[PDB]
A paper describes a structure:
Based on the CD and MD simulation data, four mutants annotated as [name]_CC1 (A101C-A120C), [name]_CC2 (S96C-L132C), [name]_CC3 ([name]-[name]), and [name]_CC4 (G160C-S176C), possibly forming disulfide bonds, were generated. The formation of the disulfide bond at [name]_CC3 is anticipated to increase the stability of the global structure as the hyperactive IBPs contain disulfide bond(s) for the intra-interaction inside of the body domain. Therefore, we generated the [name]_CC3, which was located in the internal body domain. To confirm the disulfide formation, we solved the crystal structures of the [name]_CC1, CC2, CC3, and CC4 at 2.0, 2.1, 2.0, and 2.0 Å, respectively. Successful formation of the disulfide bond at the intended location in [name]_CC1 and [name]_CC4 was confirmed by X-ray crystallography, whereas the rest did not form a disulfide bond. The failure to form a disulfide bond may be due to dihedral angle constraints and the inappropriate distance between the two cysteines. When the RMSD values of alpha carbon mutants were compared with the wildtype, relatively high RMSD values exceeding 0.4 Å were observed around the mutation sites of [name]_CC2, [name]_CC3, and [name]_CC4. [name]_CC3 exhibited a ΔTm of − 0.8 °C compared to the wildtype, which is consistent with the hypothesis that the body region is heat-insensitive.
The [name] from [name] exhibits high TH activity and relatively strong recrystallization inhibition activity. The [name] structure is composed of parallel β-strands in a helical pattern, which is mainly stabilized by inner hydrophobic interactions and intramolecular hydrogen bonds with long α415. Additionally, the [name] has a capping head region that consists of two small turns and β-strands, which contain a disulfide bond. This disulfide bond increases the overall rigidity of the protein and reduces residual movement at the ice-binding site, thereby augmenting TH activity and protein stability.
Numbering used by the authors: 61 to 276
């Protein structure tokens, strides 16, 4: 059975990036947000958008920000370890499933690999027990189209799902995502996209009136 990706301190964040967090007001974030090593000024969230703590490396950032460089250093470090752990898993259960387009699929537990961009143009289901683990390894971009919903079935939980992407993630407007995103690059959410899962970007997270909730 497939081991969890250990996020270490990064587990405490709904959104963690390296070059900031942009926003089209109003978004709804539940969980802590942070960015390092970029200045807190690069977090463009207001205080009324975040239920949780906004962490900054410095004296800049939103009014409510807490300055904690040392915690953000560990979190981003942990996020990179998680990214490398997820990317490094061997012996996939699936390689190039749906030739890189997986709309309408029900995904069962295990390790999936794509040597391409992964596209999700229509609704999918992720189906398994409360303790089953999914790791999706994507060597290109990850695209989910407008209005596309990931459904969890069988007791599958968002905290047991990891999406590792070598390229940028693009969540289409009104889309509903489930799981942790470990992006080597950006995570770009469009108007009124929901994410039940963490957005861990080694560049930036961009929001457009999005809802982000840390998985429970």
């Amino acid at each position: 059975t497939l081991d969890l990706v250990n996020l270490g301190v990064a587990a405490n964040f709904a959104i963690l990036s390296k070059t900031g967090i942009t926003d089209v007001y109003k978004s709804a974030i539940t969980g802590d947000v942070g960015a390092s090593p970029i200045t807190g000024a690069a977090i463009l969230l207001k205080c009324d958008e975040v239920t949780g703590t906004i962490f900054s490396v410095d004296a800049a950032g939103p009014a409510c920000k807490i300055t904690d460089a040392s915690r953000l250093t560990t979190a981003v470090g942990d996020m990179q370890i998680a990214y490398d752990n997820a990317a490094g898993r061997l012996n996939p259960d699936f390689l190039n499933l749906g030739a890189g387009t997986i709309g309408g699929k029900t995904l069962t537990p295990g390790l999936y690999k794509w040597t391409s961009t992964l596209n999700i143009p229509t609704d999918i289901t992720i189906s398994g027990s409360s303790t089953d683990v999914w790791i999706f390894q994507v060597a290109g971009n990850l695209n989910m189209s407008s209005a596309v919903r990931i459904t969890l079935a069988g007791g599958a939980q968002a905290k047991n799902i990891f999406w590792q992407t070598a390229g940028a993630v693009t969540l289409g407007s009104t889309s509903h995502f489930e799981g942790n995103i470990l992006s080597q690059t950006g995570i770009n959410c469009k108007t009124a996209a929901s994410i039940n899962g963490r957005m861990m970007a080694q560049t930036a997270v961009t929001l457009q009136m999005c809802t982000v909730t840390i998985p429970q």
